[PDB]
């Protein structure tokens, strides 16, 4: 019966909440208070990357920690040489409303997507001197909000319709589909072993997915509004979410709970980009208040601020060796920090 | 200092910057428009007529080019997006204007249209963006009022005390009852607009039909007014 099914679902949710409460004996802050604080963090702008016409929605670091791809609403992907601020490539797009971009771990391809509902993949290393579209992936009904490369042939995309999809690139057909969300899916983050990934949606819930199995292993419901950004701790057993309720949150897959919330009374704007450091001690979060903040992931106190942008920060990414942090905003400027 | 290959790389970057400068010249000279409306609202007919007169299975956006007096316009309407709008609407906060096409001859889904227009107007990212609303299907409205089969006072009781504004200007000249009804609808929309306008953005009403060929001219004039007020704000004139 439908009523019996609803009652069973409610009872099982209550049991899950009770189990989560029982498994929690001491909060992360109460245990971590006995570690010396990192103190004030002094980070300054080293380079500024001019050239994007319009506001920037997307940015992804290279695996070589020197190349950088950026996507802006004017309809361009620019590959910057971060050390010299030179432009390596200028990729014009068919759809100007691009609001996600990824850089392949090998460095041979870049992906992008947006309101066109298509995830386009470009071949950086061709026999010709130009960059050309490798393949265009179709099948999502809503706008594509995030894309991440597993390898040179597998990509994972999240879309406006309540569905994530795993794609084969050689054959345009979707290898696997991920359903279960009830709102727009906004952000996505692959595991260090590229076996699991999370999706943050507009249902204020984050789901831990299984790439091969194709099923939602876990669900995290702690936020009060839609989730805008999400990323794993470098350990690979935890992730952090930034939402419109002006609070960041750290979830743990193994505990299947919420560890800390990074919130302040003065901040009221919602976070739009989240990224950790290499040790995971710094949680850098972009905000709508024109400035990016730096949080201590172990004490939940705001260690520093990266404030140099003339409009809200949309994208944020920390390089693989941890030597720098790139920050992109709607003022059409990328800033390299150290 | 730096090697000869680095000179050649810097020259390549300079060439890329030259291409970006030409692209900037093209980009700055074009005004972007976001088309909005319900299914019954004849925005599809409007965009088809504009495409005919002036200038893919699950695609999420439809792009339309039209040019009036050597001024470029791109008008975008979303095709495959869900009923939710609060997320992908943030991409359209730098457009010149939002064209909200509304059906005024329905009398049943019109309150839903007012709610949608109120949500668009009060959006935190859609501020300082002037909205051009097209009160579409005027001939259907006149026919339905003259027929008398359906009335408006039942859906909106405030119509009973409503009287025709002194500024009403029916150009062709017809029954004052249809003029009173259409100006009542327009005044409801303008009341929603002026409730929280705060002077940051304006609202441009138009009694139009999807068959009308003057819609492009109306959009051009409204966009010229919007750009004029933006330039007056930018050039420290007010």
């Amino acid at each position, epitope marked *: 019966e439908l009523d019996q099914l609803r009652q069973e679902a409610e009872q099982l949710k209550n049991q899950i909440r009770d189990a989560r409460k029982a498994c929690a004996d001491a909060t992360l802050s109460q245990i971590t208070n006995n570690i010396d604080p990192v103190g004030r963090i002094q980070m300054r702008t080293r380079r500024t990357l001019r050239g994007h016409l319009a506001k920037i929605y997307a940015m992804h670091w290279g695996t070589d920690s*020197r*190349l950088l791809v950026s996507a802006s609403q004017d309809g361009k992907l620019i590959i910057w*040489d971060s050390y*010299t601020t*030179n432009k*390596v*490539h200028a990729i014009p797009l068919r759809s100007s409303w691009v609001m996600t971009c990824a850089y392949a771990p090998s*460095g041979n391809y870049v992906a992008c997507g947006g309101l066109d509902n298509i995830c386009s993949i470009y071949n950086l290393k061709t*026999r*010709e*001197g*130009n960059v050309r579209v490798s393949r265009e992936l179709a099948g999502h009904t809503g706008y594509l909000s995030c894309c991440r490369f597993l390898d040179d042939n597998q990509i994972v995309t999240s879309s406006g319709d309540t569905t994530c999809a795993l794609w084969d690139i050689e054959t345009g057909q979707q290898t696997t589909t991920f359903t279960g969300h009830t709102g727009d899916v906004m952000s996505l983050s692959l595991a260090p072993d590229t076996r699991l990934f999370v999706s943050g949606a507009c249902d204020a819930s984050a789901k831990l997915w299984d790439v091969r199995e194709g099923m939602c292993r876990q669900t995290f419901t702690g936020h009060e509004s839609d989730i805008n950004a999400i990323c794993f701790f470098p350990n690979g057993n935890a992730f952090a979410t930034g939402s419109d309720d002006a609070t960041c949150r750290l979830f743990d897959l193994r505990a299947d709970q919420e560890l800390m919330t990074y919130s302040h009374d003065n901040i009221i704007c919602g976070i739009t980009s989240v990224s950790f450091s290499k040790s995971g001690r710094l949680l850098l979060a972009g905000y709508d208040d024109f400035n990016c903040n730096v949080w201590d992931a172990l004490k939940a106190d705001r260690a520093g601020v990266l404030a140099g942008h003339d409009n809200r920060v949309s994208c944020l990414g920390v390089t693989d060796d941890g030597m720098a942090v790139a920050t992109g905003s709607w003022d059409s400027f990328l800033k390299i920090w150290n | 200092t*730096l*090697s*000869a*290959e*680095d*000179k*050649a*790389a810097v*020259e*390549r970057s*300079k*060439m890329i910057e030259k291409q970006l400068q030409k692209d900037k010249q093209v980009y700055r000279a074009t005004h972007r428009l976001l088309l909005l409306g319900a299914d019954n609202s004849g925005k599809s007919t409007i965009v088809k007529q504009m495409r005919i007169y002036h200038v893919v299975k699950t695609s999420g956006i439809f792009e339309t080019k039209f040019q009036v007096d050597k001024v470029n316009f791109h008008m975008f309407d979303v095709g495959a997006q869900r009923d939710e709008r609060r997320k992908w609407i943030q991409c359209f906060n730098d457009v010149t204007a939002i064209i909200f096409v509304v059906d005024s001859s329905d009398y049943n889904r019109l309150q839903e249209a007012l709610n949608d227009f109120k949500s668009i107007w009060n959006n935190r990212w859609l501020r300082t963006i002037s909205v051009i609303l097209f009160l579409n299907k005027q001939d259907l409205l006149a026919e339905k009022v003259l027929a008398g089969k359906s009335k408006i006072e039942d859906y909106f009781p405030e119509f009973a005390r409503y009287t025709t504004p002194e500024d009403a200007t029916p150009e062709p000249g017809e029954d004052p009852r249809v003029t009173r009804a259409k100006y009542f609808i327009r005044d409801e929309f303008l009341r929603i607009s002026t409730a929280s306008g705060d002077g940051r953005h304006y609202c441009y009403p138009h009694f139009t039909c999807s068959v009308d060929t003057e819609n492009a001219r109306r959009i051009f004039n409204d966009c010229r007014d919007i750009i004029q007020r933006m330039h007056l704000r930018q050039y420290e004139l007010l």
Partner: single-chain antibody
Amino acid sequence: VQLVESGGGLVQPGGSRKLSCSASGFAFSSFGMHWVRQAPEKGLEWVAYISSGSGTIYYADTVKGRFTISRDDPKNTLFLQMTSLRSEDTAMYYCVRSIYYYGSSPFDFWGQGTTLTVSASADIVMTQATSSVPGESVSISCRSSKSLLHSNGNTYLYWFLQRPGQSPQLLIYRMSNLASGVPDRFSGSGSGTAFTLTISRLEAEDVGVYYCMQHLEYPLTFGAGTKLE
């Protein structure tokens, strides 16, 4: 991708001739191009270089005023205009393609070449070993007058393998990076002044002449090279 060049013939001394290089199959405008010649019995010698967009044109010290180089991007062709053709110009002029960005591989493709016959300073001199050296391993070595290591960290050392037949094809750029299409057997080594190219398993197709090249500063000196038989 391909580079076809023509315009080679017997020329009386003191005359003028124009070499053309027709390119097809790649983005011509994004590639800077070079002219590299070899005498019939000598090694390769760099001639000229024109950059992408014609913003940077270089010439060798021996060809500084006699030759001029120009490109036609709409026509997708490259020209070399020759003036005052002396007797020391009888060589095999090659048309070379090169691009420059972070991680690019310059000199990656070469044309077929043209044969020209004429009737009767403080630069990094690159010196090779003796030009006389299946299944074995060979360790062709080279030496540089000046250190090729730059403050950037890239040592601009290039390896070219010319078969007894067709034109040279790039093997290793910047002493460590195997070019596209080259088998994994080839490897490059060095320390800043002396460099060694190693083939881990000789084959029948590895026979030919190995030329080295430097790109730290113009002119692009090559060296005599070594022969494998």
